[PDB]
Amino acid sequence: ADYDLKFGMNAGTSSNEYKAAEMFAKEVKEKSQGKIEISLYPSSQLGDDRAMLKQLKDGSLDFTFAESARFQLFYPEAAVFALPYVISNYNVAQKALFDTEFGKDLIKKMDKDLGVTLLSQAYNGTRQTTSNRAINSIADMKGLKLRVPDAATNLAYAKYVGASPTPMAFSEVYLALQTNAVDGQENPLAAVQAQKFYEVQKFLAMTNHILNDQLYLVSNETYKELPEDLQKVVKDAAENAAKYHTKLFVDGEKDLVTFFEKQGVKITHPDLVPFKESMKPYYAEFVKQTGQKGESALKQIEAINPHH
Numbered sequence: 001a002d003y004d005l006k007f008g009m010n011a012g013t014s015s016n017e018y019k020a021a022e023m024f025a026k027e028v029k030e031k032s033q034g035k036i037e038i039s040l041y042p043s044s045q046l047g048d049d050r051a052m053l054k055q056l057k058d059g060s061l062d063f064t065f066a067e068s069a070r071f072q073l074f075y076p077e078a079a080v081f082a083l084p085y086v087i088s089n090y091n092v093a094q095k096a097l098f099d100t101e102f103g104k105d106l107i108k109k110m111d112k113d114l115g116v117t118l119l120s121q122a123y124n125g126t127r128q129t130t131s132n133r134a135i136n137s138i139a140d141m142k143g144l145k146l147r148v149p150d151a152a153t154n155l156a157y158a159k160y161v162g163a164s165p166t167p168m169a170f171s172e173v174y175l176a177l178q179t180n181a182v183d184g185q186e187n188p189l190a191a192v193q194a195q196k197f198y199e200v201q202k203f204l205a206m207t208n209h210i211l212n213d214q215l216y217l218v219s220n221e222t223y224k225e226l227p228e229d230l231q232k233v234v235k236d237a238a239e240n241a242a243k244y245h246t247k248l249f250v251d252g253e254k255d256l257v258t259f260f261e262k263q264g265v266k267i268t269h270p271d272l273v274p275f276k277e278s279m280k281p282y283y284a285e286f287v288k289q290t291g292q293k294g295e296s297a298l299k300q301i302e303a304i305n306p307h308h
């Protein structure tokens with residue numbers, strides 16, 4: 001094609017993210033009259049999300065996914081998106097990004113400093129905790145060997161609830177769980193399904209601890225080469241795909257617990273009051289580390305009403 005473009009992702013071929021990227025790819029090809037074709041590179045083939053963001057910056061990858069929280073790698077205050085229990089729901093995540101001074105500035109920095117244009121935002125689920133033993137209460141976390149992604153906020157979740165974290169790439173998790181090298185992991189229900197972690201985890205606890213969004217990002221190096229009519233095709237397709245993406249997640253959260261029960265998983269509902277209480281020293285550490293910019297981001301986000 002005139003523009004042979006590439007979209008990389010950690011998510012695999014059975015995932016919601018991939019299904020929505022397929023919708024995006026198909027719409028772009030159709031509405032560009034074949035000028036643009038987007039090929040998908042799932043399952044971390046190109047590296048992880050940190051690697052893929054560098055490739056968008058350099059212009060060697062055209063599209064990728066990232067959470068708003070992942071930008072904590074560059075702007076420490078952006079950890080606010082994934083401080084456990086701070087963002088209440090997806091309504092709040094949307095307004096945090098687009099309707100706060102903090103979020104608007106973050107979007108501008110991503111363009112100026114990181115070489116990426118934000119096309120759309122979707123919901124990617126609320127993270128839960130799977131394990132090889134029941135989590136009936138916060139006590140059951142103590143010493144649990146909990147795999148985390150290589151992200152500070154997930155590491156802190158694990159630390160502050162009393163678990164023993166092991167960071168590792170998404171691609172390595174299934175084997176770690178299968179072999180009981182670790183005792184558990186944490187991800188939204190849709191990922192537990194997509195990765196088939198239910199095959200190798202007997203328990204699932206509704207910890208509801210971190211809310212993931214998902215940004216459709218394009219390399220500025222690529223986006224600047226597309227004539228404006230094709231920029232609009234791409235932008236409009238990303239917005240349409242994001243709405244679909246969100247719906248996939250919302251619908252799964254309604255019935256995936258029954259799916260997991262049919263696969264033999266035992267579901268628990270630990271009291272979350274101690275889980276929330278356990279994060280209070282972490283929020284204080286965040287404020288100490290990130291200073292006024294972090295205090296401000298927190299205040300801006302805490303001000304958002306969660307009801308539509």
Ligand SMILES: CC(=O)N[C@H]1[C@H]([C@H](O)[C@H](O)CO)O[C@](O)(C(=O)O)C[C@@H]1O
Pocket residue numbers: 009010011049065066067069070148149150151169170186187191214
């Ligand atoms: C956009 C993206 O790659 N998201 C990935 C996230 C983030 O890397 C992590 O939450 C830090 O932001 O990690 C996973 O949930 C995980 O490894 O368990 C896989 C998911 O596909």
